[PDB]
Nucleic acid binder design. Structure first.
Lengths: 405, 550
RNA sequence: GUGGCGCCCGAACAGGGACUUGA
């Protein structure tokens, strides 16, 4: 019955020779406790060290559960085999769901565990669990079947998913559906209670084929940017004017309609940073021009899909965060805000990445204001999703922090 | 050997190499030929002369324990060609992770690599030729091999896994070629299970003694000595040389860092800044009084003996720090007071400019990494720092810095920012517009400041770019200023330096900056751009531009 | 003669911040 597709990397693309960062025993116990069962059900298989390729492992305990599940950091594998899901078996991206009231993310990782896989491709998906204190070498394994965290297995699973979803959505037309990764989306601009009813009906319909499926709920259409607004204190100190003047000079690159002539007129008279300086009619006219501008968005940018996304992020204080997105610099697409520190950060990247999923159908490249060892060590505990973004680290300038207060 | 032998191929589209034999002696020749006969009649090696035109060279030796001309080989022309394997045996087992187990033992292996065969599609590539002359090819795992330890450990684990599942109560740690085995059981049953293990392995053709070092320990293990309930380094001394060389320096540095992991209270920093610029291997450098006072400290520490401990999984463990100053940090780990598991050293410089709390975060996260890789659980903490400081730091900082559960200790010294900054200027304070520049060709920079009163200033400098020019400019400003102050500059460098709030740094001028900044009770800082005509900023930039910007 | 781990010291690539030649 099974007839897997011949799959292969781009020529001139080695496999993932990657290490495995440290782990804890509390996770290792559960990892063994579940991989043994995965191995008994014919899903995976032991090997020797004859193959060098590796791929990391890390545990989770996600929201709406208390188990000890797992997932894999397949970042290199996807980056190197992206041709497969880009041309061989690809799918289009709609743009209707983001204007709808409500959605509901699903998780269908179990169905992937009922289909075999190419034998020539299994050595590119070795995953090692370590042993503490380098006592024993790694208990290596190999994936026999289509694994989670990889963006080629839903690509080929969409064919039988189409025959799965055939009956109901001809009945239920007004719903939009996506399938990016192990997770699944459902567009429903209708009543949220009826949304839940149809979600339960769909869950039962998946159970009909023996599919077990036990943030979670989202409302995208109300999202907007934070238009940069400025104070209106009739009094002004020279500190305020200098701060505003540097703000606008750095913002000039974004908004070409930016003028600071009258504000620079007030500074030829040197004085302290506490006197009052009445803004003339001309200077307040310039303010009003700027404030009428910033209520509007940019005019001249567009979503280039073939490029990559860069989702920068900043910290402000008070437990209040920001985020900025761009393909090319100084051409923004979406900004915003979002209210312990590291937990806020993983929540924020989860939120932003889901937003990117629903809007553009792609995961961005991050630039975080934090060290490498800290995140690499601690991020594994508080994560709750089932996918991975691409990230790096940055040495943040204290002027982009002046984006918002 | 009915073992589950492994398939092994060669790299994509390549061949086995061909080399010439070396010019060697006559005495070793018949001796190593007899060695070859011994290994052959031991059931290891296949002799094939006219098989194929491959010739892997030989590098024999008169190794340690003279007259024992052991068999040797080179494989540098093939190890680059052999297909990669995986290696997770990267680090080493730390003594701490070794658990408190009463009935301990050990079983080494003799000629381990020479007991596993190799796959007949690969025995061709083992051309061991020697002077007519004659060729001899392995059927086994030889040395000089890239994938021999991995195959060795894999087959060993898969062999002893039934033994593991039969007695999971018993612990088995392995290494390159050695077996640290132990339990908390009684000796009549210990040796019984060990003899059953011996017969279990000799079912697969493996060596093991009974007259080994079981009560003969402590062992010697990568420089470590292991008592049953205690442990320590291989015993250490230090040279009494009246002078010092750089080889002598690096020797003792490696020695004490190999001893720092158990010995609390060590200093190396001033004893290692000497190497910067020290690059020749004969330079007789002095024993400068900083280093003299340091190594006297160190020898006082070492003159007393000490021993470590092992780990009990039940009793939760504790970390602690006894800071000893000068950007250096030590750390103790103990499950009970005065019984230290291990210690060490951390004085790295993440950026030449830094503060103390940054270094502390660095240290605790590195200690968490090591405690994870050793035991598998991050520890509870006990740190010399108040909560309000941590709260002020991570609220007024442009990054995220977390630490696990912790608490306060009243162990002097303390950690505290020697100053701070305000987010709001002052009425009655002074304004200071400053700037300063220099040349790429003469380096004869100029710097100064100006107020709103008029008490301006100009200062020339030398041998620098504009960054240190601005820094000396704010220095001269603070020296010419008073008690509180409000300052404005035109550089993001000085702001990025100051607002990190460092208390110690390398070059002397930022040290002077902070030294006189602590005196001024209050201070504001801001930033503005250039080439816009912003008040005094243009004036000063004009005034210092004379003779600089032409 | 070779390889591996550690400590120290030096050369190439990306990002950021600053100074010179042209419409």
């Amino acid at each position: 019955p099974i007839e897997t597709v011949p799959v292969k990397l781009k020529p001139g693309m080695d496999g993932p020779k990657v290490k495995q960062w440290p782990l804890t025993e509390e996770k290792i116990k559960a990892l063994v406790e579940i991989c043994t069962e995965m191995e008994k059900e014919g899903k995976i298989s032991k090997i020797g060290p004859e193959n060098p390729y590796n791929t990391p492992v890390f545990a989770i305990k996600k929201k709406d559960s208390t188990k000890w599940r797992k997932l894999v950091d397949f970042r290199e594998l996807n980056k190197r085999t992206q041709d497969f899901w880009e041309v061989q078996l690809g799918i289009p991206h709609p743009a209707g769901l983001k204007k709808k009231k409500s959605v509901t993310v699903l998780d269908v990782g179990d169905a992937y565990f009922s289909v075999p896989l190419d034998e020539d491709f299994r050595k590119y998906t070795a995953f090692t669990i370590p042993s503490i204190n380098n006592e024993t070498p790694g208990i290596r394994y190999q994936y026999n079947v289509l694994p989670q965290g990889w963006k080629g297995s839903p690509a080929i699973f969409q064919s039988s998913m189409t025959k799965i979803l055939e009956p109901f959505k001809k009945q239920n037309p007004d719903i939009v559906i996506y399938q990016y990764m192990d997770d699944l989306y459902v567009g429903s601009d209708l009543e949220i209670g009826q949304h839940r009813t149809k979600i339960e009906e769909l869950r039962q319909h998946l159970l009909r084929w023996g599919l077990t499926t036990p943030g979670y709920e989202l409302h995208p259409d109300k999202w907007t940017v934070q238009p940069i607004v400025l104070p209106e204190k009739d009094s002004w100190t020279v500190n305020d004017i200098q701060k505003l003047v540097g703000k606008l000079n750095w913002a000039s690159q974004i908004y070409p309609g930016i003028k600071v002539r009258q504000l620079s007129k007030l500074l030829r008279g040197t004085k302290a940073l506490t006197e009052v300086i009445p803004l003339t009619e001309e200077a307040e006219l310039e303010l009003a021009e700027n404030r009428e501008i910033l209520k509007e968005p940019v005019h001249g940018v567009y979503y280039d899909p073939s490029k990559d996304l860069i989702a920068e992020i900043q910290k402000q204080g008070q437990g209040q965060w920001t985020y900025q997105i761009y393909q090319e610099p100084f051409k923004n697409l979406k900004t915003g805000k979002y209210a312990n520190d590291v937990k806020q950060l993983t929540e924020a990247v989860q939120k932003i990445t889901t937003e990117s999923i629903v809007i553009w159908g792609k995961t961005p490249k991050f630039k975080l204001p934090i060290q490498k060892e800290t995140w690499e060590t601690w991020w594994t505990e508080y994560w709750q999703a089932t996918w991975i973004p691409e990230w790096e680290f940055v040495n943040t300038p204290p002027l982009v922090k002046l984006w918002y207060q | 050997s009915p073992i589950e032998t492994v398939p092994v191929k060669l790299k994509p589209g390549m061949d086995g190499p061909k080399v010439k034999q070396w010019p060697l002696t006559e005495e070793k020749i018949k001796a190593l030929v007899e060695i070859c006969t011994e290994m052959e009649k031991e059931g290891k090696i296949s002799k094939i002369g006219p098989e194929n035109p491959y010739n892997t060279p030989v590098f024999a030796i008169k190794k340690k324990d003279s007259t024992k001309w052991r068999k040797l080989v080179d494989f540098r022309e093939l190890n680059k060609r052999t297909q990669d394997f995986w290696e997770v045996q990267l680090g080493i087992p730390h003594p701490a992770g070794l658990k408190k187990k009463k009935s301990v033992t050990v079983l080494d292996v003799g000629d381990a690599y020479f007991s596993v065969p190799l796959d007949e599609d690969f025995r061709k590539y083992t051309a061991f030729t020697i002077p007519p002359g004659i060729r001899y090819q392995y059927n086994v795992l030889p040395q000089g091999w890239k994938g021999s330890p991995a195959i060795f450990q894999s087959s060993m684990t898969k062999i002893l896994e039934p033994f593991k599942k039969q007695n999971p109560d018993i612990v088995i740690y392995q290494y390159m070629d050695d077996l640290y085995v132990g339990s908390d059981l009684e000796i009549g049953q210990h040796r019984t299970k060990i003899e059953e293990l011996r017969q279990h392995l000799l079912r697969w053709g493996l060596t093991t003694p009974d007259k080994k070092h079981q009560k003969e320990p402590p062992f010697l293990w990568m420089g470590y000595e292991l008592h049953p309930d205690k442990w320590t380094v291989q015993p250490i001394v230090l040279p009494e040389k009246d002078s010092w060389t750089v080889n002598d320096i690096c020797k003792l540095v490696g020695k004490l860092n190999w001893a720092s992991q158990i010995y609390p209270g060590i200093k190396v920093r001033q004893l290692s800044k000497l190497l910067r610029g020290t690059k020749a291997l004969t330079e007789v450098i002095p024993l400068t009084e900083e280093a003299e006072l340091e190594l006297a400290e160190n020898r006082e520490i070492l003159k007393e003996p000490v021993h470590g401990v092992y780990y009990d999984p039940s009793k939760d463990l504790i970390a602690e720090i006894q800071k000893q100053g000068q950007g250096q940090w030590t750390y103790q780990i103990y499950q009970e007071p005065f019984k230290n598991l291990k210690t060490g050293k951390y004085a790295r410089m993440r950026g030449a400019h830094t503060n103390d709390v940054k270094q502390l975060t660095e240290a605790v996260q590195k200690i968490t990494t090591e405690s994870i890789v050793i035991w598998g659980k991050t520890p509870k903490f006990k740190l010399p720092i108040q909560k309000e400081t941590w709260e002020t730091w991570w609220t007024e900082y442009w990054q995220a810095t977390w630490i696990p559960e912790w608490e306060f200790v009243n162990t002097p010294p303390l950690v505290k920012l020697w100053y701070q900054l305000e987010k709001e200027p002052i009425v009655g304070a002074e304004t200071f517009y400053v700037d300063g520049a220099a040349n790429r060709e003469t380096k004869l920079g100029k710097a100064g400041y100006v107020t709103n009163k008029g008490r301006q200033k100009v200062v020339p400098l030398t041998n620098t770019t504009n960054q240190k020019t601005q820094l000396q400019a704010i220095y001269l400003a603070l020296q010419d200023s008073g008690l509180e102050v409000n300052i404005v500059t035109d550089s993001q460098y000085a702001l990025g330096i100051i607002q990190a709030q460092p208390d110690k740094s390398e070059s002397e001028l930022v040290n002077q900056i902070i030294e006189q900044l602590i005196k001024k009770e209050k201070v504001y800082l801001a930033w503005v751009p250039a080439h816009k005509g912003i008040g005094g900023n243009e004036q000063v930039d004009k005034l210092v531009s004379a003779g600089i910007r032409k």
